């Protein structure tokens, strides 16, 4: 007699409450606790790559090729 | 909120200010002009420098412009 | 130890204005 | 789904005037009588089939209205009505709280009209320096 | 005030910022070819060819070659000595706190 | 009678009792128009086409010149005979100051201007040769203006004429197709075959000059036709009942191009005219008229419904019926294309001998020939506006398919805005990255062909099958439909190039989706102020104004260019960005990677480098290599005949310039000024009195529109042009 | 069954200007704008957007290789997640600056009533303060994982996407 639906559409999703939840959590969050991790956030990478050789570059060494820094010319 | 000030003389209409958008109008009686009557503004809280006010609205010097300032979601005029 | 002084650009550009368009965010909720 | 609802006002569903956020800051409505269902044009676009009744129906932007209060002057017709109409309703209106026509002009009609200056005399205006209490304004 | 601090930390850096960068204790040796040597450019964009690059005058880095004349009216009221710069420095700092 | 003026004309205050210069352009500026006319017809329908006349005797007025300074100055003989080296002439100029040199004297002993644009090859195409010819068609001509002028006078003036049977629309919608289509197409085929054809296929080799087969001959006796592309020529015409086959001979499906000089053949142009050609005779009739055989007029289109889309697209105006304005959008977007799609075309596959190795018009032409176009498109709906605003009367519509849009805008507008930003934005914000890719960017890895390639690739697509078309699939024809399109199967003459399988890739899903973007955000500019325009969610209200019309508030904190007048006021600027775009896409391909030279070890050798590919990636590279590489041409050009494109674009940057004087300043700023000088008149007295007021805003929002619009294009072809002709 | 809601607009009074056709509100599958936290009314947060961070992160796999900077290359098919984590965690700042939009400082929750709660005037302001900002740690615990699931697990391809 019901033409249904959904309207009420589809099972109340997954027994789910739990670890994800809570477990771990960054969270809480904002106001205070939000730098808390976007400090660490921009300062990580950054700091720790704004460095680490020796090396990695895109690389070149030694002058030369006829001499350089010369000539001759010295050293 | 509107501006900045604006002047003297005219109405009746039947040939001026007959033509605000957002009302801003009324017509006091008061003595002086060849019949009666003085206006700007009964109101200015629902314009909006609607300012066709005086295109339609002689009498000589400035005469209607807007000055907002403040300039208001009443009539900066958005709404949504 | 040494190697750096890039400490400073990853800031001025990175974090620093992560942190303007952060915290006068603003001005309005400053 | 359906009713309430008894417009006409009518034309059905299309975005381009009157929407979701400004059932708070304000909302705006327009009553009248409608001669015939005598269609007319109506802002999104559609044509109204106006009616039996109303006249009420919704439309944010005051704007919207005289304008439509006139727009019944191109078929001939006439007296426009609106209100306010808000959370939590109330106001906010001038046809009629007397309909006072903006022109007429009438009873009391009050004060807030001009400067001392008649304009003419117009010029640097420094009575200025910082005034307080002193001007502001006028 | 206030700005007359940083046109006085505009300054005691740029001034801090050469003997670091660029080359005048070097230099002083032999004084007009030149590419005029402004900063040092941190740009973690710019392809390997930063030899190819801006390996220019005293470098080691893509460095850019400064206009700001300057590097005269720094020579004529007195050094050639960075070692006798630091000070400049450190005294349009003695001019920006003060 | 009448007339005559004299104060006042049809802006209802416009005698005024004067006061005021500033009234010389708004006469000038209504004057055409109507509404400020009227749309009752029984004098506005009896305007149009009065017209509509003109244009025509000015058309006539026109070419009538392109043959008396064709020929009463050929560089047409003396060098047709010639094709190949030696080319165009149509003007040389007075000994006045130093006119001359710009009357070259490089054309086969002429003096004179070279000459871009056909006509030498609009005109060995018929044939007709012999300057006191098509001088003997100079006269054809202009009277024959005279007589089509000479109709203004016929009707409306002694004869005040007729919209009764104006509106109605049937008998011309069915004519035009037959009628005057079809004098015409097959009626250009009797002289395509008799006089066209041969006198073209025997100057395919031998037939130098003078004894030259004065069309006079091939009526009544055949012999010679008949001794060429035979037919056998008794007096029965077989298919008259199929013997078809046979009075073929000389028109099967042959496509490619006459590789003894480029074109492509007049062999493929009969059966090309008189089939689209009937078809326009037959199918032009279809509607009622009177004999009881046609279709709705617009009782076909209420034919069909559709649920939402409801009514369907029903009941089709009926003012569409009555007048212009409403009508008048769809007779140029159409038309406009119809002329981006010759254009897109004519280049694309060579009609009239002498084209494909050509350039100075394998370019040249390919251009205005877009102008014309988008220009006529791109300002095309300012009449979707006008209408609404305007020749729309009372009501007719509701539930129209009409009005099922105008509710449904802000929700059709908007989500091309996206589009509109999406595509663009990013897909031209895409050179730039290369930029930032080139310079900073190390050809390491980025978007170029050997780079953000896309190995094989881009194909191809389709064009090739384009080249399996020809030798299965649609059974024949003859060679690939257009060389442009294929494989490698590969032509040209005339030492230089023709056109090759001009392959695409990297360089080309590039660029394009800048045409593929702009002419998004180009209409909906358009669009959001087509739709509102009348009813702008935001000054709702406005047939309260007028068409023009310039802003309106300081308040609701800045109501600006809100008309769509105004919208067509910047509805222009773009296409000029790009129409005067794509042009430049097109002569860089043409050239660079299409046109050529010959030498010979496997060679062709282009104008410019195959650069191009990896040197129009990179934003930049159109100024690197499009400009200082290009203009050097014009650049140096002077004490020559390069000695106007030397001195055009000059004067045509400022005129770009003096655009922005009128068009960033202000209004009242202006006004207020001209009084100070008026001082000087004044006291001193001589002043006016037409009150020398200073010009009214829209009226220089239309200006820095005009002159803008007047100065980047000359310019570049101040420029274009000049590049083409010795590298060229 | 019969025909349907077609013309006369949105639901209720035909001048309410959001929009009814399908892609609103029908039969293929409108389903989908409502287990996803998309309409409903719904409940709380965590196990509705860490669905988003767990099925957002690994989104960008994409983009974060072939485009960009290295394609393919050394340090090096790390690629699926790099600082791809990295460049988020202002992605998961970005909405911990939102909370403006969203106040209270508590989360009840959760049930409801009878009676009912999710008070029959949702379409808006449920949301809060204290109140949002635990979806928060969802998108980010979920975005990091939504990132790092896709990197410990698989690189030469296989069938995933087949459709579906
Ligand atoms: C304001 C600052 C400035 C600074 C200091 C930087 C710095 C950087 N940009 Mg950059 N960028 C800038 C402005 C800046 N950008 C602007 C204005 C634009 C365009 C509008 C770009 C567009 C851009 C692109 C497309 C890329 C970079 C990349 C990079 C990184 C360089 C190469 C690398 O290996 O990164 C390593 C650094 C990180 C991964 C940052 C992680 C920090 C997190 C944790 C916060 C580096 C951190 C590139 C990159 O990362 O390679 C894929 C590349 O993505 N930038
Ligand atoms: C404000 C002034 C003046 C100016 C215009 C500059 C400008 C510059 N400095 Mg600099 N510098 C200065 C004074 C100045 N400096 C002084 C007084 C010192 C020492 C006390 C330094 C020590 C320094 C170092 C170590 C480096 C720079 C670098 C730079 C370049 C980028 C650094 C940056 O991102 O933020 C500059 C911000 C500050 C000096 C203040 C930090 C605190 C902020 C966030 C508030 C840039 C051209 C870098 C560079 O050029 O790359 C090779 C880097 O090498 N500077
Ligand atoms: C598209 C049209 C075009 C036009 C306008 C003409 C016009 C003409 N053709 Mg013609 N013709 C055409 C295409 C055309 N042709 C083609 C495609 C062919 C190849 C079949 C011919 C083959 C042809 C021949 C062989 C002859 C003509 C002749 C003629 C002329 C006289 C016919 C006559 O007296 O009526 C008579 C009516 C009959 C039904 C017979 C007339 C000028 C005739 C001519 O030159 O002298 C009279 C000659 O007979 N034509
Ligand atoms: C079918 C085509 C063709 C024709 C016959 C017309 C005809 C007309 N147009 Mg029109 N127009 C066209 C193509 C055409 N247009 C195109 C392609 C565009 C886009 C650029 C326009 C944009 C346009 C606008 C904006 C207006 C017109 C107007 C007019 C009317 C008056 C023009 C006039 O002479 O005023 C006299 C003005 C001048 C002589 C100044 C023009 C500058 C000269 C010196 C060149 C007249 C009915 C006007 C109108 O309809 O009135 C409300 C006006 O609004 N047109
Ligand atoms: C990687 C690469 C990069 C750097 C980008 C970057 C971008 N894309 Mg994008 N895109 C890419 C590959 C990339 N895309 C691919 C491979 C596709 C499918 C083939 C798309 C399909 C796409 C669409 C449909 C849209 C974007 C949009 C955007 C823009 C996002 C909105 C914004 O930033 O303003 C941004 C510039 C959006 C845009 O332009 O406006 C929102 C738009 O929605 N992209
Ligand atoms: C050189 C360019 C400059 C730049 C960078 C832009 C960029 C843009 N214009 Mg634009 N414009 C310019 C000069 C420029 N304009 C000039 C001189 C005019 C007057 C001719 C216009 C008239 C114009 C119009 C009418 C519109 C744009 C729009 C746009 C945007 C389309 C999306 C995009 O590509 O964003 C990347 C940055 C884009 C921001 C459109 C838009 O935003 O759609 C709603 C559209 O409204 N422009
Ligand atoms: C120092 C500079 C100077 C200045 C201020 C200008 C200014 C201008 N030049 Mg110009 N030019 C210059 C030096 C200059 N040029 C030099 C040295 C040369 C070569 C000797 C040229 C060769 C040149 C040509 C060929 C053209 C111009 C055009 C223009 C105008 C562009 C008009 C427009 O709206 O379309 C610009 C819109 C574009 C989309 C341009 C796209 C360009 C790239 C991204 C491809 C503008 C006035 C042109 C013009 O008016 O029509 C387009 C065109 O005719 N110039
Ligand atoms: C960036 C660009 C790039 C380079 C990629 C790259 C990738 N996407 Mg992807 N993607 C993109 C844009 C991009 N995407 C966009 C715009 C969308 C929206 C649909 C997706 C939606 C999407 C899905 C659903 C999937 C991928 C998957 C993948 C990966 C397939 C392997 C896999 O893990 O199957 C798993 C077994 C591959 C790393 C697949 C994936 O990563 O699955 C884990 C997965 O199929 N993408
Ligand atoms: C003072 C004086 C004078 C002077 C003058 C001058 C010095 C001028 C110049 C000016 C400038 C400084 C500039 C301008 C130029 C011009 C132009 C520029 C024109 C134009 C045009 C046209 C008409 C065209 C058209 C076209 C087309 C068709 C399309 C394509 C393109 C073209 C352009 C070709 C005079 C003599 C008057 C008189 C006396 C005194
Ligand atoms: C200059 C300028 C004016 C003033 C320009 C005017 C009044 C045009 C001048 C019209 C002509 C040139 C009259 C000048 C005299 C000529 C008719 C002929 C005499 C000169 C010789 C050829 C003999 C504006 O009105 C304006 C409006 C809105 C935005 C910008 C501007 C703007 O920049
Ligand atoms: S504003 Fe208009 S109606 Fe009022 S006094 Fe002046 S002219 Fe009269
Ligand atoms: S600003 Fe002008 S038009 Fe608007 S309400 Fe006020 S007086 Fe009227």
Redesign the interface.
């Known amino acids: 007699w019901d033409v249904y639906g959904s309207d009420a559409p589809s099972p109340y999703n997954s027994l789910q409450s739990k670890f994800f939840e809570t477990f771990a959590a960054p969270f809480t969050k904002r106001g205070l606790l939000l730098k808390f991790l976007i400090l660490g956030g921009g300062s990580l990478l950054t700091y720790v790559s704004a460095n680490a050789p020796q090396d990695v570059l895109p690389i070149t060494r030694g002058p030369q090729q006829p001499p350089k820094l010369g000539p001759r010319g010295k050293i | 909120s509107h501006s900045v000030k604006i002047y003297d003389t005219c109405i009746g209409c039947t040939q001026c200010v007959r033509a605000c958008p957002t009302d801003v109008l009324e017509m006091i009686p008061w003595g002086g002009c060849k019949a009666k009557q003085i206006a700007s503004a009964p109101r200015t809280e629902d314009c909006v420098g609607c300012k066709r006010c005086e295109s339609a609205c002689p009498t000589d010097f400035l005469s209607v412009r807007v000055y907002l300032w403040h300039e208001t979601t009443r009539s900066m005029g958005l709404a949504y | 130890m040494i190697?750096?002084?890039?400490?400073?650009?990853?800031?001025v550009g990175?974090?620093f204005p992560?942190?303007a368009m952060?915290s006068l965010?603003?001005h309005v909720?400053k | 789904e359906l009713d309430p609802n008894t417009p006409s006002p009518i034309f059905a569903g299309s975005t381009g005037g009157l929407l979701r956020k400004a059932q708070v800051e304000e909302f705006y409505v327009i009553t009248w009588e409608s001669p015939k269902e005598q269609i007319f044009e109506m802002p999104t676009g559609g044509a109204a089939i106006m009616r039996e009744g109303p006249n009420l129906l919704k439309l944010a932007r005051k704007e919207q209205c005289l304008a439509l209060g006139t727009r019944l002057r191109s078929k001939y017709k006439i007296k426009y009505q609106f209100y306010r109409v808000f959370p939590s309703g109330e106001v906010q209106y001038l046809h009629p709280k007397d309909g006072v026509y903006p022109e007429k002009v009438n009873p009391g009609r009050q004060g807030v009209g001009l400067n001392m200056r008649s304009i003419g005399k117009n010029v640097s205006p420094i009575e200025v320096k910082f005034t307080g209490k002193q001007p502001y304004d006028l | 005030f206030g700005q007359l601090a940083i046109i006085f930390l505009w300054t005691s850096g740029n001034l801090f910022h050469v003997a670091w960068q660029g080359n005048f204790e070097a230099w002083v040796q032999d004084p007009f070819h030149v590419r005029p040597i402004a900063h040092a450019i941190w740009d973690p964009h710019f392809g390997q060819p930063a030899v190819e690059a801006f390996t220019r005058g005293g470098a080691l880095g893509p460095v850019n070659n400064a206009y700001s004349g300057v590097y005269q009216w720094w020579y004529t009221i007195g050094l050639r000595t960075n070692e006798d710069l630091y000070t400049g420095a450190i005294f349009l700092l003695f001019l920006s706190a003060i | 009678f009448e007339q005559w003026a004299k104060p006042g004309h049809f802006s209802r205050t416009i005698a005024k009792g004067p006061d005021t210069t500033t009234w010389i352009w708004n006469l000038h500026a209504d004057a055409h128009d109507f509404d400020s006319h009227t749309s009752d017809l029984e004098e506005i329908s009896r305007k149009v086409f009065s017209a509509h006349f003109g244009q025509l005797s000015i058309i006539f007025l026109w070419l009538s010149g392109m043959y008396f300074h064709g020929a009463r100055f050929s560089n047409y003989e003396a060098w047709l005979n010639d094709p190949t080296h030696i080319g165009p002439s149509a003007q040389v100029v007075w000994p006045i100051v130093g006119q001359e040199i710009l009357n070259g004297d490089v054309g086969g002993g002429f003096r004179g201007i070279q000459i871009t644009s056909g006509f030498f090859q609009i005109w060995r195409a018929s044939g007709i040769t012999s300057e006191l010819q098509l001088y003997c068609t100079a006269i054809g001509a202009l009277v024959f203006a005279g007589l089509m002028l000479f109709a203004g006078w016929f009707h409306y003036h002694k004869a005040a004429p007729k919209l009764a049977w104006f509106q109605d629309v049937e008998s011309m919608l069915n004519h035009h197709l037959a009628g005057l289509l079809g004098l015409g197409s097959l009626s250009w085929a009797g002289h395509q075959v008799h006089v066209s054809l041969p006198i073209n296929q025997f100057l395919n080799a031998g037939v130098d000059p003078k004894e030259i087969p004065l069309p006079h001959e091939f009526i009544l006796n055949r012999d010679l036709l008949a001794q060429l592309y035979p037919s056998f020529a008794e007096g029965a015409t077989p298919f008259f009942t199929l013997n078809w086959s046979k009075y073929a001979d000389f028109l099967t499906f042959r496509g490619g191009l006459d590789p003894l000089t480029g074109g492509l053949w007049l062999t493929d142009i009969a059966h090309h005219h008189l089939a689209i050609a009937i078809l326009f005779l037959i199918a032009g009739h279809m509607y009622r008229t009177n004999w009881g055989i046609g279709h709705g007029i617009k009782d076909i289109l209420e034919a069909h419904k559709g649920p939402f889309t409801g009514q369907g697209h029903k009941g089709l105006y009926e003012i569409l019926t009555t007048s212009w304005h409403a009508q008048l959008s769809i007779n140029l977007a159409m038309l406009g294309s119809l002329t981006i799609v010759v254009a897109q075309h004519m280049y694309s596959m060579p009609p009239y001998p002498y084209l494909a190795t050509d350039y100075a018009t394998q370019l040249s032409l390919f251009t205005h020939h877009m102008w014309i176009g988008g220009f006529l498109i791109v300002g095309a709906a300012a009449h979707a506006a006008i209408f609404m605003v305007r020749d729309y009367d009372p009501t007719t519509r509701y539930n129209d398919l009409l009005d099922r849009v105008l509710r449904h805008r802000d929700a059709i507008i908007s989500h091309l805005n996206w589009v509109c930003i999406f595509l663009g934005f990013h897909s031209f914000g895409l050179y730039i990255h290369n930029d930032t890719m080139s310079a900073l960017g190390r050809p390491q890895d980025m978007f170029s062909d050997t780079a953000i390639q896309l190995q094989p690739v881009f194909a191809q697509w389709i064009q090739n099958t384009h080249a399996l078309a020809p030798g299965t699939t649609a059974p024949g024809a003859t060679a690939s439909t257009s060389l442009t399109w294929g494989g490698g199967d590969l032509v040209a003459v005339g030492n230089k190039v023709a056109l090759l399988p001009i392959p695409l890739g990297t360089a080309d899903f590039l660029v394009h989706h800048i045409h593929a973007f702009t002419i998004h955000v180009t209409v909906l500019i358009l669009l959001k102020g087509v739709l509102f325009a009348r009813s702008s969610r935001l000054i709702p209200d406005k047939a309260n104004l007028g068409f023009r019309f310039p802003c309106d508030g300081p308040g609701r904190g800045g109501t600006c260019q809100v008309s769509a007048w105004d919208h067509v006021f910047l509805g222009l600027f773009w296409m000029y960005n790009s129409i005067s775009v794509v042009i430049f896409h097109f002569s860089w391909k043409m050239q660079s990677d299409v046109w050529g030279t010959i030498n010979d070890q496997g060679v062709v050798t282009h104008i410019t480098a195959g650069n191009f590919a990896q040197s129009s990636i990179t934003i930049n590279g159109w100024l690197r290599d499009f400009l200082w590489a290009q203009a050097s041409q014009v650049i140096q050009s002077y004490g020559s005949s390069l000695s106007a494109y030397g001195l055009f674009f000059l004067g045509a940057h400022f005129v770009w310039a003096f655009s922005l004087m009128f068009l960033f300043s202000g209004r009242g700023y202006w006004q207020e000024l001209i009084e100070s000088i008026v001082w000087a008149h004044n006291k001193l007295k001589v002043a006016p009195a037409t009150q020398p007021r200073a010009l009214s805003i829209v009226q220089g929002r239309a200006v820095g529109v005009t002159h803008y619009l007047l100065g980047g294009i000359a310019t570049t072809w101040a420029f274009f042009l000049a590049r083409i002709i010795a590298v060229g | 069954k019969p025909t349907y809601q077609v013309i006369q607009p949105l639901n209720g009074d035909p001048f309410i200007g959001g929009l009814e056709t399908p892609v609103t509100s029908s039969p293929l599958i409108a389903w989908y704008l409502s287990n996803l936290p998309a309409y409903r009314t719904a409940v709380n947060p965590l196990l509705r957007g860490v669905e988003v961070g767990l099925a957002h992160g690994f989104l960008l796999v994409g983009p974060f290789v072939k485009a960009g900077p290295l394609r393919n290359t050394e340090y090096a098919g790390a690629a699926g997640s790099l600082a791809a984590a990295g460049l988020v965690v202002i992605l998961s700042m970005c909405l911990t600056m939102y909370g403006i939009a969203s106040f209270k400082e508590g989360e009840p929750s959760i049930a409801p009533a009878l009676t009912l709660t999710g008070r029959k005037k949702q379409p808006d302001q449920l949301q809060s303060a204290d109140g949002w900002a635990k979806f928060t740690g969802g998108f980010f615990f979920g975005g990091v994982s939504g990132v790092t699931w896709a990197c410990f697990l698989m690189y030469v391809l296989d069938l995933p996407y087949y459709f579906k």
């Open positions: 190697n750096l002084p890039s400490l400073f650009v990853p800031l990175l974090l992560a942190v952060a965010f603003l909720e």
